[PDB]
Design an enzyme around this catalytic site. Structure first.
Site, PDB file in Angstrom:
ATOM      1  N   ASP A 147      39.874  55.937  19.138  1.00 30.06           N
ATOM      2  CA  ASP A 147      38.465  55.583  19.270  1.00 30.06           C
ATOM      3  C   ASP A 147      38.305  54.128  18.865  1.00 30.06           C
ATOM      4  O   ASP A 147      38.351  53.802  17.685  1.00 30.06           O
ATOM      5  CB  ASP A 147      37.636  56.482  18.340  1.00 30.06           C
ATOM      6  CG  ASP A 147      36.141  56.219  18.376  1.00 30.06           C
ATOM      7  OD1 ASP A 147      35.710  55.211  18.971  1.00 30.06           O
ATOM      8  OD2 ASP A 147      35.398  57.024  17.776  1.00 30.06           O
ATOM      9  N   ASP A 182      32.992  60.413  18.112  1.00 27.68           N
ATOM     10  CA  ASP A 182      32.270  60.076  19.333  1.00 27.68           C
ATOM     11  C   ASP A 182      31.716  61.333  20.015  1.00 27.68           C
ATOM     12  O   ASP A 182      30.598  61.348  20.530  1.00 27.68           O
ATOM     13  CB  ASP A 182      33.169  59.321  20.302  1.00 27.68           C
ATOM     14  CG  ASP A 182      33.510  57.925  19.847  1.00 27.68           C
ATOM     15  OD1 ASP A 182      32.775  57.381  18.993  1.00 27.68           O
ATOM     16  OD2 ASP A 182      34.469  57.352  20.395  1.00 27.68           O
ATOM     17  N   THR A 233      33.603  56.468  26.759  1.00 23.91           N
ATOM     18  CA  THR A 233      34.837  55.697  26.709  1.00 23.91           C
ATOM     19  C   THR A 233      34.421  54.363  26.086  1.00 23.91           C
ATOM     20  O   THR A 233      33.270  53.965  26.273  1.00 23.91           O
ATOM     21  CB  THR A 233      35.533  55.499  28.075  1.00 23.91           C
ATOM     22  OG1 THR A 233      34.575  55.174  29.084  1.00 23.91           O
ATOM     23  CG2 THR A 233      36.327  56.737  28.476  1.00 23.91           C
ATOM     24  N   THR A 234      35.265  53.648  25.357  1.00 20.36           N
ATOM     25  CA  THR A 234      34.771  52.382  24.794  1.00 20.36           C
ATOM     26  C   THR A 234      34.823  51.273  25.841  1.00 20.36           C
ATOM     27  O   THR A 234      35.862  50.671  26.078  1.00 20.36           O
ATOM     28  CB  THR A 234      35.564  51.948  23.544  1.00 20.36           C
ATOM     29  OG1 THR A 234      36.972  52.096  23.769  1.00 20.36           O
ATOM     30  CG2 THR A 234      35.151  52.765  22.327  1.00 20.36           C
TER      31      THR A 234
END
Lengths: 494, 513, 513, 74, 74
Positions: free
Chosen positions: A53, A360, A86-87
């Site tokens: 993450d 998340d 999703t980052t």
């Protein structure tokens, strides 16, 4: 020491470098074959944090001289109201900096250009409520509840081989979560693994401590006690009296368990085993805080604390075998307001991804209830928006257009990234993807298992609607702080 | 053989850097208000050369190790059949390379991405087939002689405060140059003197040389003589050694022999009526006294290039030994005289009956900025010849570029899989040109791009970038046009080698060594 | 002998590095979707030569210390007996070296592994009359003359836009070439002019030299004269000097003597009717005036190599002193003239009675890619000559390679002891070629290998790798075929070269034959 | 399109510097209290030259690399 | 002990430099389209503060040797 003299172009450059270094590391983190990152530091950090993450590890530390700690901080506020999927926010912000070289080419003034971010903010909102999407997420929802965003969020994480199943479970947790309170009292821990299910769901709070090997294995109709506070012969006798007070009050109640957030005296320990009562030593305060709301709580004082002043819920408290290891279960709370989520895995210390994947994950589907709105996953949203946004730059009068168009092409990388890691050629993928989206079918998306494109809805992937509205507003502004600042006042001993 | 090792990524990068460096210098050059680049070099050239023509300076110089010379060389073929207008072709190719950085993210097959050149074959189609260019350009033509395309080439050039008039002059030169007789014998020089006209049109060829202080000032019904071999005499191929003789009596004949060379030159020169002699090299002293009395003007060390053009001009002659006079040589006869111009003294050859060859003389302030006129002029001669018979043109000021960009964006998405990715990248390539034209005008490039696209999208091919305005306007009113071939040839060159090899769009990269 | 101390593993490494370094550069070259090449050098190379022909560049230079030049030198031997189609033999030899890494773990005797290559002789032999191919190639031929293999050789070359047409032309050239002698008198010159056809076929020989500005433009029933000794007369290596004459009067006799050399040249030149004179060296000025009036075209400093081919063409002649005219000289008579070919003027010799010797002239767009055509022709000529004599060729596009690979896999487990480990490794080597061919195509190589194997295993020899499609297709329609001897020799040669690498203590430079 | 290169603002400075250097030398020359200036340089000149007239002194010598001589000729 | 030597005209420069250094950060801030800046620092500072007010940021810190802090104080 005194030094580090930088101005104009060099000061801008420090901002430039911070964005490029971060983007490469976060770059393979987006999509099904994301890469596992593991990071450790000395001191109080502990041991095992292996981070998949991007937001979690970045927030935790500020290791070096270049300025980027503050941009990183910004992503979490986004995370609290939605965050992940999703980052991608950091990547989009970072790519904006490349055009800064062209800013000197424009050779006038950078401030005129930054107004584009405000415009980008409008661009963010006009990329939100127009150019439709799924229009599902009715509430509870037997099939669309999950196997969706989490599958894509999980896609960036390796454990997808058995974890995609885990992902389905997480929305069940949100179904109970929705209602009277807010996003509170949710605790989840990984327990390595050794089962097909790879997770058991607890109807109540999860705890991990033991008084000692001796003591009764199970308790039923359990009353729970939580305490804030932990002639020479008569002194010895007096110790017996502490034992006596604890036992006399205990038997009438029928006390089945005792939990205390501190050191526990040895004498009472012998008593609990014979009585049929299990106690917990130095239990974490945070676990207790969660627990009080759940069980109706109590007033924690001195030994007067048992009976009526304390309330004990009584469904089932037991130590059970979870795949292999033993973990305590507090469950059957009458209130139902707060719950605990439990997950497992294959075990390669990549499983620990689930420790923060989950962070998340926790916010995303809790959010899903509140929104009653969602978007198609698998990058379906990104290609559609990209087709619409290219037109949009000319749609605006000016200023807005330049930044909006660059922003539009940014969306192109996400489809590429989703299939790049998928084990299929990105080039073939990007072209075929657009044709289905431009066609008018919002259900079309990246079919990662397939290696081509397919119906995302059939697969079952949707993203929380909030992830897209906040992320777009947040991304532009998070990006703006590094480009607009030329010369950061400091002093850097290091 | 030896040094400079590059492969795949690194090699692609060298191509990348060459395109970006050239683009910035050419960037200021384009459109109604461009900028001047001034160059000084060492060991092979006299001084400061300033060129607003990207093609002229590039042909001359290969400054460094990175590759760009071969791309540059090709633009010249373009000049022979069309060329100039404004230098925009180099810019389109350079921006192609920027997308390549986003391709490494993909990290698999640039070749699959590359689906675009077949798609860019479309560019050969869309860019120069839709929009009605121009038509008549009758012949000689009163008003339509200029005040249009030559002006646009010059507008991009700084000298337009007074050089717009100069451009107008150049078509007059082309009118004499039209018909049958080839593109040859056009000579132009600049003079250090300020006047409103800033240029003078001669009736023939201009040369700058004099016999000496003595000799008649002006000749009429002039006969022109050109000799390959020098007037100088003594050594011959075999020396015959330096001789000594049996008494003072025979040394005299040697001096006497010198007199004979003098004798031949006057005796048959007189029959012709010789008014002027031009020799490309050293000139013997003895004839010099003779020419002054005769009334004949000769030129010492005349430049050979002037001479070859002159032969075409006067019908020419065969140049050999002193037998060369009379019939072997042909001389035109209007007026040859030395006339002071602004400040300097020049010799004017004029009234050539044949008419194929003509010369233009420029005049100016005396600034480096003035040297700009030389760069603009060269550009103009090539522009007009092509405009007259190509019978085809496109709207300038970036009008063509924005229109094609809108059309190419549609092409992406419409094509299904594989085909779409490169086609959009090719499409964004048109966008930088609008930016290049606006930046040099002092107006905010960001603001300009947005407003520009909306007018082109509407359907007015006439509308384009107006730099004086700072926004958008009607290009046609300005009279800004680009020849059809200049735009047509570049699109094929960009999408030529590009097609078949890695057969599709997002080129080159290195190969062996 | 003995200086460079490298031993066993380090010695092996030098061989190892040389093979990998060359494999990547040549890798682009092998399929229809190949790429052109750019080279930079210092030290009398004067220009960048663009060569995607692996053989040509490798032969020209020995760039660095690691050995590979002798390995490189050998491929040319392959070239006279065939040479091309596409390069590939070098790649296969290189691929064998990388698995040698697994052999250090093995840690035994390098030579014992080598038995695989003797086994490979079996593979070489059974790769023969196993492949299943095309027959025909009768002689001359109707429509199978080309649009086949020459095109494939060209496909790997960047020039295949305009160029594929050029290749088609080359077979016409080979048809005249057939007989006993194989490759004598074939010459090609690049032209800088522009034509869609991009090529012109001359019935004779092409030069590029001129007598001077004067002289008759065209000659009929031409007689040809070649002289070993120059027209120039004076110093020799024993000096007349720079002579002494008593009274200037006698210097005149020397001048007169010069006239006698002129007299001999004119008096017998006239009887023959001499139309053209070709001399390989400096020409004296006096005869030059004579030739113009006579009506004879002469060539100053003609290159000797052109002359030797021309002699075979005319019928030959005995070259000696000025007695050389009439019978001692044999002149062929048809047409000798200087014809402008769209741009730079050249002299054309044509109408040769012999017919054995011919010249091909190329034209093009005008670029580095155009110089590329010179590179392409050399490959085109060699293939066709081989195609007629062999009477056997094999399916191209890697069709041959997959079929053999399926058969060899069975062999490894079946054979006894040492033979089994060796044979199995040789079999996997064939697998890489399909991967290399697919990768340059623009389609996914991984997907390609599996699909490829299924079609070959089944029994369709025609089926092969289709690079433009990206999948497997029918090779025969495409026209890609490889000469049968290319495969016979590569099989035997690949095994012998790989085998000696492990054995030898040091590598360094060339000397054998 | 390159030689000795400076761009926009730096390029501007080379012209900027030439004008300031000339103005101070010439300023003392003007009016009733103007003063005489003398120059000495190495090789191909001799020694002392004194020119009250600003035009005569500027024309004679091209002292250094920065541009100003063309302005001087006019 | 001794590293930097300055007198009269250069002394003016040190003073000159301080005004230019402050002006670039402040100018972006001025008027309806200004910017925000973040400062880290170390010791007796909780966390980075980001200040839009030129007055507030200058008062809080005295970063280096050149004199500008007193001008700020007023």
């Amino acid at each position: 020491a005194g030094a580090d003299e930088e101005r104009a172009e060099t000061a801008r450059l420090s901002s430039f470098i911070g964005a490029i270094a971060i983007g490469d590391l976060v770059k393979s983190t987006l999509g099904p074959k994301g890469m596992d990152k593991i990071l450790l530091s000395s001191g109080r950090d502990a041991s095992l944090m292996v981070t998949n993450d991007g937001a979690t590890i970045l927030k935790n530390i500020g290791v070096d001289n270049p300025a980027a700690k503050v941009l990183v901080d910004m992503s979490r506020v986004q995370d609290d109201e939605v965050g992940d999927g999703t980052t991608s926010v950091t990547v989009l912000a970072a790519e904006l900096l490349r055009e800064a070289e062209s800013l000197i080419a424009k050779k006038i003034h950078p401030q005129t250009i930054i107004a584009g971010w405000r415009e980008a903010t409008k661009a963010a909102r006009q990329a939100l409520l127009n150019s439709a999407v799924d229009h599902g997420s009715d509430e509870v929802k037997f099939r669309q509840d999950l196997m969706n965003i989490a599958g894509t969020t999980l896609s960036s994480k390796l454990l997808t081989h058995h974890k995609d199943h885990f992902t389905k479970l997480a929305v069940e947790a949100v179904l109970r979560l929705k209602g009277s309170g807010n996003l509170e009292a949710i605790h989840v821990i990984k327990k390595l693994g050794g089962s097909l299910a790879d997770s058991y769901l607890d109807e109540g709070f999860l705890l991990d401590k033991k008084i000692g090997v001796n003591q009764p294995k199970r308790i039923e109709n359990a009353k729970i006690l939580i305490a804030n506070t932990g002639k020479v012969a008569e002194i010895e006798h007096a110790e017996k009296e502490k034992m006596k007070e604890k036992v006399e009050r205990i038997l009438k109640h029928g006390i089945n368990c005792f939990i205390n957030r501190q050191l526990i005296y040895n004498y009472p320990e012998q008593l609990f085993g014979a009585a049929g009562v299990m106690a917990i030593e130095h239990a974490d305060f945070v676990g207790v805080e969660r627990l009080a709301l759940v069980t109706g709580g109590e007033i924690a004082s001195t030994f007067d604390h048992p009976e009526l002043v304390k309330l004990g819920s009584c469904k089932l408290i037991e130590e059970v075998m979870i795949g292999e290891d033993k973990l305590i279960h507090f469950s059957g709370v009458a209130l139902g307001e707060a719950c605990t989520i439990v997950l497992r895995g294959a075990t390669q210390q990549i499983l620990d991804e689930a420790e923060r994947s989950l962070h998340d994950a926790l916010c995303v589907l809790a959010q899903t209830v509140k929104d009653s709105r969602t978007v198609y996953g698998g990058g379906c949203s990104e290609m559609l928006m990209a087709h619409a946004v290219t037109q949009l730059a000319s749609r605006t009068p000016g200023k807005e257009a330049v930044a909006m168009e660059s922003y539009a092409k940014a969306l192109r990388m996400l489809p590429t990234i989703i299939a790049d890691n998928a084990g299929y050629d990105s080039a073939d993928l990007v072209a075929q993807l657009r044709a289905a989206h431009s066609e008018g079918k919002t259900t079309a998306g990246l079919d990662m298992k397939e290696g081509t494109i397919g119906d995302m809805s059939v697969l079952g992937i949707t993203e929380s609607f909030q992830v897209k509205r906040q992320v777009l507003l947040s991304a532009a502004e998070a990006a703006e702080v590094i480009l607009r600042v030329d010369n950061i006042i400091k002093a850097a001993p290091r």
